[PDB]
Amino acid sequence: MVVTKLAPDFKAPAVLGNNEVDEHFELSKNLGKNGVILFFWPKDFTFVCPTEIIAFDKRVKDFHEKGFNVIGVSIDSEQVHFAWKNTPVEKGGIGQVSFPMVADITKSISRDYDVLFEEAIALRGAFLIDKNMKVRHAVINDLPLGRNADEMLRMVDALLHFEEHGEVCPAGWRK
Amino acid sequence: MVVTKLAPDFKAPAVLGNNEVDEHFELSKNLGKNGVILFFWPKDFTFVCPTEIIAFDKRVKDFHEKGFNVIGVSIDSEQVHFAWKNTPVEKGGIGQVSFPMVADITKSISRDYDVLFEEAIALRGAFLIDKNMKVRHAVINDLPLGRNADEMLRMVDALLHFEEHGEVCP
Amino acid sequence: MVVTKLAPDFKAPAVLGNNEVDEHFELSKNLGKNGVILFFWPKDFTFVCPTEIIAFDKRVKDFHEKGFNVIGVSIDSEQVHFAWKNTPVEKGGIGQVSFPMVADITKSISRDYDVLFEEAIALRGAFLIDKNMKVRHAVINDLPLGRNADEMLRMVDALLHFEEHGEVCPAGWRK
Amino acid sequence: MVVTKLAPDFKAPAVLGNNEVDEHFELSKNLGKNGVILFFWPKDFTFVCPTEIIAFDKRVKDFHEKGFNVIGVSIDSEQVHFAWKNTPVEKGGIGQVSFPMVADITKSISRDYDVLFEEAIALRGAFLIDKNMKVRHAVINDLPLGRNADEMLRMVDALLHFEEHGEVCP
Amino acid sequence: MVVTKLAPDFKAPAVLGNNEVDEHFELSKNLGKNGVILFFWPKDFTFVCPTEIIAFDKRVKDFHEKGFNVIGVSIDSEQVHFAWKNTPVEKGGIGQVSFPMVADITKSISRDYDVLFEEAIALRGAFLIDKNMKVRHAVINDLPLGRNADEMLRMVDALLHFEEHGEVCPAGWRK
Amino acid sequence: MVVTKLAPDFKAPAVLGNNEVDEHFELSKNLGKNGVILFFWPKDFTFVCPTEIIAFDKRVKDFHEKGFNVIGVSIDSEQVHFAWKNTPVEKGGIGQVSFPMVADITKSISRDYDVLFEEAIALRGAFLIDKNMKVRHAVINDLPLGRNADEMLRMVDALLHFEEHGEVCP
Amino acid sequence: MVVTKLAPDFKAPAVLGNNEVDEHFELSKNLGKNGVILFFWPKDFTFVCPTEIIAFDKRVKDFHEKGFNVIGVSIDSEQVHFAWKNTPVEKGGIGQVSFPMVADITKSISRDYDVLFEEAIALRGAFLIDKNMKVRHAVINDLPLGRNADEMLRMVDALLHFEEHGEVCP
Amino acid sequence: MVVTKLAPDFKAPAVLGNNEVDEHFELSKNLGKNGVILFFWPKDFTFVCPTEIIAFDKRVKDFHEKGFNVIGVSIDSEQVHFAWKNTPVEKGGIGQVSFPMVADITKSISRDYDVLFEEAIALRGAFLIDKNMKVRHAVINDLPLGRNADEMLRMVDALLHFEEHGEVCPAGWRK
Amino acid sequence: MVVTKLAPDFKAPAVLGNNEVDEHFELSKNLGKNGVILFFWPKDFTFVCPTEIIAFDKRVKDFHEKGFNVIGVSIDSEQVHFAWKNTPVEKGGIGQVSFPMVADITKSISRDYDVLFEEAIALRGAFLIDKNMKVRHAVINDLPLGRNADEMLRMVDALLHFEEHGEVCP
Amino acid sequence: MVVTKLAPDFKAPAVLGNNEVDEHFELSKNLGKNGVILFFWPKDFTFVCPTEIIAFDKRVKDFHEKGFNVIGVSIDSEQVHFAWKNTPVEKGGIGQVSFPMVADITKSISRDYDVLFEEAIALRGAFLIDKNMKVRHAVINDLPLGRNADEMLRMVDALLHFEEHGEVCPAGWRK
Numbered sequence A, C, E, H, J: 001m002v003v004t005k006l007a008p009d010f011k012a013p014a015v016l017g018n019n020e021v022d023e024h025f026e027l028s029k030n031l032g033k034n035g036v037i038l039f040f041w042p043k044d045f046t047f048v049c050p051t052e053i054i055a056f057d058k059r060v061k062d063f064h065e066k067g068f069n070v071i072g073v074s075i076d077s078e079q080v081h082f083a084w085k086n087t088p089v090e091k092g093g094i095g096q097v098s099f100p101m102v103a104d105i106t107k108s109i110s111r112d113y114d115v116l117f118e119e120a121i122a123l124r125g126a127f128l129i130d131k132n133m134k135v136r137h138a139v140i141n142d143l144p145l146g147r148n149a150d151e152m153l154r155m156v157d158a159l160l161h162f163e164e165h166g167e168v169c170p171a172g173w174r175k
Numbered sequence B, D, F, G, I: 001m002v003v004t005k006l007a008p009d010f011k012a013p014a015v016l017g018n019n020e021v022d023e024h025f026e027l028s029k030n031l032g033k034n035g036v037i038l039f040f041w042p043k044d045f046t047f048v049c050p051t052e053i054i055a056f057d058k059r060v061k062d063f064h065e066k067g068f069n070v071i072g073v074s075i076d077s078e079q080v081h082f083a084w085k086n087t088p089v090e091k092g093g094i095g096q097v098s099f100p101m102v103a104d105i106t107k108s109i110s111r112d113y114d115v116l117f118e119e120a121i122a123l124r125g126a127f128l129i130d131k132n133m134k135v136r137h138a139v140i141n142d143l144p145l146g147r148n149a150d151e152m153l154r155m156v157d158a159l160l161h162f163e164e165h166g167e168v169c170p
Helices: A051-065 A078-086 A108-112 A148-163 B052-058 B060-065 B078-085 B108-112 B148-164 C051-065 C078-086 C108-112 C148-163 D052-058 D060-065 D078-085 D108-112 D148-164 E051-065 E078-086 E108-112 E148-163 F052-058 F060-065 F078-085 F108-112 F148-164 G052-058 G060-065 G078-085 G108-112 G148-163 H051-065 H078-086 H108-112 H148-163 I052-058 I060-065 I078-085 I108-112 I148-164 J051-065 J078-086 J108-113 J148-163
Strands: A011-015 A021-026 A035-040 A068-074 A101-103 A124-129 A135-141 B011-015 B021-026 B035-040 B068-074 B101-103 B124-130 B134-141 C011-015 C021-026 C035-040 C068-074 C101-103 C124-129 C135-141 D011-015 D021-026 D035-040 D068-074 D101-103 D124-130 D134-141 E011-015 E021-026 E035-040 E068-074 E101-103 E124-130 E135-141 F011-015 F021-026 F035-040 F068-074 F101-103 F124-130 F134-141 G011-015 G021-026 G035-040 G068-074 G101-103 G124-130 G134-141 H011-015 H021-026 H035-040 H068-074 H101-103 H124-129 H135-141 I011-015 I021-026 I035-040 I068-074 I101-103 I124-130 I134-141 J011-015 J021-026 J035-040 J068-074 J101-103 J124-130 J135-141
Touching: A011 A068, A011 A078, A035 A051, A035 A148, A051 A068, A051 A148, A078 A101, A078 G078, A124 A148, A135 A148, A148 B148, B011 B078, B035 B052, B035 B148, B052 B060, B052 B068, B052 B148, B060 B068, B060 B148, B078 B101, B078 C078, B124 B148, B134 B148, C011 C068, C011 C078, C035 C051, C035 C148, C051 C068, C051 C148, C078 C101, C124 C148, C135 C148, C148 D148, D011 D078, D035 D052, D035 D148, D052 D060, D052 D068, D052 D148, D060 D068, D060 D148, D078 D101, D078 E078, D124 D148, D134 D148, E011 E068, E011 E078, E035 E051, E035 E148, E051 E068, E051 E148, E078 E101, E124 E148, E135 E148, E148 F148, F011 F078, F035 F052, F035 F148, F052 F060, F052 F068, F052 F148, F060 F068, F060 F148, F078 F101, F078 J078, F124 F148, F134 F148, G011 G078, G035 G052, G035 G148, G052 G060, G052 G068, G052 G148, G060 G068, G060 G148, G078 G101, G124 G148, G134 G148, G148 H148, H011 H068, H011 H078, H035 H051, H035 H148, H051 H068, H051 H148, H078 H101, H078 I078, H124 H148, H135 H148, I011 I078, I035 I052, I035 I148, I052 I060, I052 I068, I052 I148, I060 I068, I060 I148, I078 I101, I124 I148, I134 I148, I148 J148, J011 J068, J011 J078, J035 J051, J035 J108, J035 J148, J051 J068, J051 J148, J078 J101, J124 J148, J135 J148
Parallel strands: A035 A068, A068 A101, B035 B068, B068 B101, C035 C068, C068 C101, D035 D068, D068 D101, E035 E068, E068 E101, F035 F068, F068 F101, G035 G068, G068 G101, H035 H068, H068 H101, I035 I068, I068 I101, J035 J068, J068 J101
Antiparallel strands: A011 A021, A011 A101, A035 A124, A124 A135, A135 B134, B011 B021, B011 B101, B035 B124, B124 B134, C011 C021, C011 C101, C035 C124, C124 C135, C135 D134, D011 D021, D011 D101, D035 D124, D124 D134, E011 E021, E011 E101, E035 E124, E124 E135, E135 F134, F011 F021, F011 F101, F035 F124, F124 F134, G011 G021, G011 G101, G035 G124, G124 G134, G134 H135, H011 H021, H011 H101, H035 H124, H124 H135, I011 I021, I011 I101, I035 I124, I124 I134, I134 J135, J011 J021, J011 J101, J035 J124, J124 J135
């Protein structure tokens, strides 16, 4: 089980948004004011679509506004990460995205979150981690439809509302 | 992990939408045409909003249309699942619901799906199972904010929309 | 074996008589002056009869008068406990009983007293626990006839008599 | 636990009510028509009142009427069970009794029923066994106050009364 | 092996000669000036003969005169021991004997001396224990003929002679 | 324990009464008609009196009459058992004896009967074996005072006397 | 050790020289006529000179002439092997290469050949496998200085030169 | 794995170049300024050719000039080593070579470097060990063609070059 | 122990007296008519006197006459055994010898006979094996002083002399 | 293996030369100035010949002259040892020999030297033990021909010579 427990930390090398590589990127030292969204994806230079990487790069700003950071990780090295970032989008590239990409080269991180599939690559999953390094929400999927990048943003709202004016519902539930 | 693997099959007392009580409800049977949406909730007679149950009761029909059954499960007993349905919603009751409610009295199911929290109650989580008892998608959180019924539906659509029309990403 | 040994303690949430919930109800901190009667029962919102719960609620006062408290427990949560107490007796409810109802949600207590049946629910059993947390008498049954709620009261008498004018019997036993 | 499970079957020396001495008394045989009432007591020649034995001797007939045999057991040997029956009750004797007395010399029976106290003597406890060697009810305490014979009877009645006429609780 | 080794001690309840019961009778604290004869026997209220108990009771005095005490033990409780002592000899009783009778209720003593037969009763055996708690001689038998009660007495003599004027024999053994 | 159990059977070099040397003397063979009297002694060429051997040599005939063979055993080798018989009794010799002397060179026999003391020599002990290789009586001590031959005989008698005429104890 | 033993056979995705993507490339199949030269390199898209890849691409033909296939392997995925070939060499690309590139995504191959460094990437090492899946020669270092392609060739020659003409050492 | 790790040390007897035997020759105390080349070979007084020993003896000076020492080892005793050195080259001898020959009589060293073949003799392997006792390069072979003696010398150059003016290559690799 | 037990059979390279090199020399084969004399020595090319080898070379014929083959063994390889024979005895060589020299390269033989000292070399020891692969005599020391060849012969004689004419000790 | 290792010590009862028995004879405290010859033999009062005991008794003096003591041991008790010494030689006896005879009654010594045959008796073996309790030479045999008593004496010479003027041999071995 992952949800409710401490989000497993990691110190791996990651390619920042500005493309300069951080050798010892640490999950916990890179949280938003309200936490972060850690997400995985099978592999770089995929043949299908970066559905995941795409959706998320498009919300990075919406998330910042909500106090959350976006951190994506893949079992690919940081070199190949960088490469994908610099490969022209039409040429299959990913384009210079705005979030850190972590290199889980030894597949340890994926294992820790239990998304490591058949000892090779990470599933398409995302985790809502709060300011206390606790995983509150988690959605993992095994299909191309990278909906969770969006969905997560929707949960981040539901969470900040509920966190505020608490939870309300069917006016006739208790009277 | 749960996803990408065969959905752990179970067999337990359940309180069908029509308050009939099945004693040996097997997941591996009551599937939809394309699979099912198995979902959990902490406990019946909660003082917090049933959110999970509500959101799922509404969308039961759609999930159904698109060939997906909806099975709810809790660590509570059918006797109470039952009693919860037959209760004035202002009295905190749940009210007659469409989907079957499975009684995971031995908490074995919550464990197989790994949602058992502190050997006591299950986490608010939902699972998408295809026509081959394959867990293809799982969402799980620990707060009332019911959105599992929602997202699972959207996921059911998205999935199927893709079944045919691909998705030349933007 | 349970009888003769220390009554295993527990700290679980229980719905009091006045219906307000005690989060950390402790068996040992809730004893009568002469001890207590701890009793179990399969499940709430039963379809049959609360024979158990009934019989016992009707003696709660008789027991108080004897210096014993009544404490019933079930593998059901405290919410459902509360529910049953507030469900109209004719509607199947239990009515606002006068004794604490403990929620052995994790089935640990039932296990401790060895009444936990097939890893799911508690048998219909009752335990006479003295002022020293020792279980002196125990009667467990697996039928609807909740006779032991009564029976226990009878033992509590036999005990207080025996405890007083000691044990007497057939005038011609020793001469 | 003992209840809800098959009553551990045994086979040992016993001193039948008619002072005849059976060498291989098997519980699984000497049942009643509806089952039996197996009961233990600390030790023969006790200086405390035999209470258990007394109360059970009286009710032997009724338990019998209602189809229930009554088998007593102690960790003492048949030689002493015997000698205890043939003793002036003012001399602390027990007196010719109706039910058979089993000699649990190896304390194995007391163990199977889990009444062996300190690897020495058995606790004052009684067990209700139905026609299927099923322990359905058990009462066990640690004080002379004999009420096991009593309650077991009342239980035998109650049980049977219900066998037919239910019990629309009050 | 028992002989040559320390006689295993025990603290059990025993019915004395005068019939008052000693709760914590201790083998070592009850030795003669020259040691003691510890003997066992199957069970009380036997149907056959107390051959054992008889023979021994008749020598208790001869043994005392030799500086040895007689202590008999059986897997029967002290109640039944007492009983047998008070049951009229013709009625099968044992009669008010002159030696302590120990109650090896838990069969531990019999086990210690390795005379415990088939986890139930003690064999008919006797041990010559000296002033240093060492078993010098042991005779165990499995038949009704309680000859060892006698025999032991004969050994106690041979021992006190040999202990004195040492061992002598066939005048032509060494010259 | 040894008594009440099958006498551990052995097979080893033995020096028969007639100084003939059997190489594979099996206990289970050389029994008497009613059984045997197996007995041990510390060591040959002892400076202490052979007591055990003496007392047993005398009674060999009677033990024999009553259907009981007499087999002696020591941890010493047949070569020495032999040499001990052929020695001037004033020279500490034992002298031609009637019973066979078994050589328990590997001390395995002394162990099976549990008389091996300090992994070295055997204790002065004797065993009564009935026609069924059953140890029915055992006497064992640790001092010269030979009385085993004696008592075993008296025991052989007593036993047999009872075989017929009971013994209405006094 | 690896040498003198059967070359661990594998089966994984590979990007053939003609950018075709084989899913089940088995070493035990794609051998040469005399064997093969299996070789590893740390990682694709390296910022250090691909040395290994370069030197091997050149000599692919000769190794081929002499009956030796050339299979390269990395812990990277075919998707990236592919993408690495289709990249401007000034952009750090590798450029269309002649030999197949195997994707050791589970690092299992690097392990079997024992070149897996820190459970992460493979060491710059090459292996000579004869027509019998026998590792006959292995060179392995940990620095860019590509000379494996070189020496392996010279070794392929030398070896074969000897196949016939011996070598009366100087 | 051997490369990248610390070169296992050893203290065995070795026949020096000047033929006097060093009883406790220690790998680490016998390194060149830049390291050393440790090489093995099946056995002395071979029937085939000393290809290995030959090639290597011919570069000993070249390696010295590069700051490396040559140290060869074989599972043969140092007596036989000495013998071979003094056996006339045409008589099958090896001739008075200029490098230390180590006697791995117990086959431990060979085992350590994992060149020990079928519990009997060492494979034909060579190891490039740096000034920090780390094995940088390793080439092991199972054929007569002792090419690695040469090859190693070539690597030692590549290394000192690379170590200096670093690594260069295809002018159009990055621009 | 080695003696009184079957001589551990081996099979290894050996350099027969006639410098022919057998690859699979099995002890269990090359026996004499009455058995063999297997013997070890520390190491070839020793700077200490070969004593063992010398003394055994001389007596090879006699040992032979009396039906005893003579097999020498060392932890050195046949290549060196060979080279040692073909060496000027002033050059420390051994010189063409009559008996076969076994190469115990894996030290397994020295171990089976338990003469392996410090997992390195064998102790100067000799073993007498009869026509049934039975070790009947063993001499083993740790100093040059060659006398094994000697004593083994004398033992071979003595033994045989006794084969017939006994030996009424003095 | 025994040779080269420390000679296992022992403290057992031994019948001296003068026939008085030493209760705690200790191998190490009974060495000659140059060591000792420890020898075994199957059993006393043998039916065949004391070949062993004979040969050795005849050299006891020669050995003393060489600085070595002779100590023979047998799995027989010291009583029987004594007996054999006092039984007239023609009567099969051994005669009053001049060396200590040890009683390995528990077969431990035989075991320690690994001459204990089939858990019963000792093989005919002899060990040359030096002044440092190290077994330098060992000859064990399983036949009647007690040649080693002699042989040992021959080795003791070879040893004392070698120990002195060292080892010499074939004048043309090294030149």
